[PDB]
A paper describes a structure:
Proteins of the RRNPPA family are the most frequent pheromone receptors in Bacillota and use small secreted oligopeptides as pheromones. Our results reveal that distinct maturation processes generate multiple mature pheromones, which bind to receptors with varying affinities but produce identical structural and biological responses.
Rap3T shows 4 times lower affinity (EC50 20,75 nM) for the putative Phr3T C-terminal canonical pheromone (SRGHTS) and more than 10 times lower affinity (EC50 69,75 nM) for the possible maturation variant of this peptide with one less amino acid. Meanwhile complexes with RRGHTAS and RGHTS peptides exhibited P21 space group and a Rap dimer in the asymmetric unit. Comparison of complexes with RRGHTA and SRGHTS peptides showed that the sidechain of Arg in position 1 for RRGHTA mediates a network of salt-bridges with D264 and D335 plus hydrophobic interactions with M304 meanwhile the Ser in this position for SRGHTS only makes a hydrogen bound with Y225. These differences in interactions for position 1 may explain the lower stabilization seen in thermal shift assays and the higher EC50 value from thermophoresis assays for SRGHTS. Accordingly, the complex with the shorter peptide (RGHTS) showed that this position is empty, explaining why this peptide shows the lowest affinity for the receptor.
Numbering used by the authors:
A (entry chain C): 1 to 5
B (entry chain A): 7 to 45, 48 to 70, 79 to 371
The structure:
Amino acid sequence: RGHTS
Amino acid sequence: SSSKVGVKINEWYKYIRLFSVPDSEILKAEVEEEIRHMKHDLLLYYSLMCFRHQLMLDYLEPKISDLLEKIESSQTDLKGILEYYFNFFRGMYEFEQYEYLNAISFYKQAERKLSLVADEIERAEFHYKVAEIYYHMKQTHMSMHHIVQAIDSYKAHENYTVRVIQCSFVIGLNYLDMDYPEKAIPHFKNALDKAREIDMSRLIGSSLYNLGLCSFAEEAYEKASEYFKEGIRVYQDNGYEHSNRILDILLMLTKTTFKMRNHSEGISWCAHGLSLSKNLNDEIMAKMFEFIHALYVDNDNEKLNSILNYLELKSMLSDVEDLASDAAKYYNEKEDHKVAVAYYEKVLYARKQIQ
């Protein structure tokens, strides 16, 4: 997954 | 003066959502001085805020279980918006512990009492955290439904730049999950520019990482490795050497260097990530570096399926699909179409499970 911070 | 302190807890929450640390510490000290000479479940509200405050601190600079003990102690006969804060904050914590089933259960219980929430900003917080866990679960349509509500409320207000940058992350990442990288680059770039405005190193590195995911989707592997290298630099040059999310960047660089047929650098990068993952005690990210090693080094397929099953029992079917995509493509390029068939079938299984 990507960074949804 | 129980209402006076509950009002100050409300202000404490407001400064927490604004990412204003000095104000949050001021109001934590003010409230704590009131708790000593005070007449309720206000002590839970105070504890709930001490919990939320801790989540903000951990996010800004990387125990908590003692605060969970005071939260989980004597939660008999909950009602009102205190029950909402309870389920919402416990869901945020469960999300931070890779507990997706529990975090979704708590988020849905917080959703039932959402009409009790009057502040549009607080509802924007709920909508953003729900869209976040829905993107991680690749419920793309549901995540988009919540993220547009949240970002509209945030953008209507001022000084919520941090939360708006995270909303840009979620929006672009859902476009990327729909095979629209050129639609995701504008949002990630916009968030990057605003990330260097407030000089938020963590957000800058995360913007570099998401943009590198865009170059990875377009098979511009060099530009992806450039984003991944600079994101690793930004993370490990600004006090984020031991933040778990840096593994997501190292891991992508490990795929990218491996896809560029640079076997030696990929060997070193997979080693860097496996070691740091064991150091930060993250079994999830560790087994995901184990997949890339067992696939791109010694072609250990039983290990690949063991990891894929492990990742499924954690309800992380998204990462299951990504890894089976890596293996099916790699074995297809090596003319090993039998095992490439098997892993393409697992991509199909994961996609159906996500529905």
